[PDB]
Amino acid sequence: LSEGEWQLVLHVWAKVEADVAGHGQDILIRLFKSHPETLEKFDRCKHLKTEAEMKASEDLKKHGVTVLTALGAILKKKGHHEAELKPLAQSHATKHKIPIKYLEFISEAIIHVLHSRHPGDFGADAQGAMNKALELFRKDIAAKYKELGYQG
Ligand code: HEM
Ligand SMILES: *Cc1ccnc(-c2cc(C)ccn2)c1
């Protein structure tokens, strides 16, 4: 990414940081509605059936904050994120067993929520920048997955 593209990424991410939990809720709800098979990866989660139940779930809201906190730290590294990706690849390859296709699904949900909530800060320039940033994340975590023996 160019420096300008990183700045577009972090500009819209600052909007996410104004209410991390609400963004995380919308992102995970979009993920679970669009790809319900991902629900099975979480404990005490398959039982959630309606959007209202999903919005009421403290576990879901906590999880969305966990995801966005870690992703935001990664994005702020502007690609220099090997030390941040290392523990994530470790757990997601060997314990949670999250295939790259699921990381694509959550990337799509992130982009959907950012476009829905911040269209003025998420035009084609910023969309493409965020696309590139999330593609770089997925590329680098996929390489670490394989180092750990996981071909997902
Ligand atoms: C942007 C992508 C993602 C980020 C930054 C992220 C980040 C994290 C972090 C920081 C944790 C807690 C520490 C750890 O266990 O490593 C975690 C836990 C977890 N993640 Fe991810 N995650 C991502 C995507 C996903 C996806 C797409 C799934 C499933 C479809 C998933 C499933 C899980 C599970 C099952 C846990 C265990 C925590 C729990 O639910 O008890 N992750 N994630
Ligand atoms: C429904 C859901 C979504 C995301 N995370 C969870 C969860 C549940 C527990 C018991 C612990 C950690 N995360 C649930």
Ligand SMILES: [Cu+2]
């Ligand atoms: Cu969780």
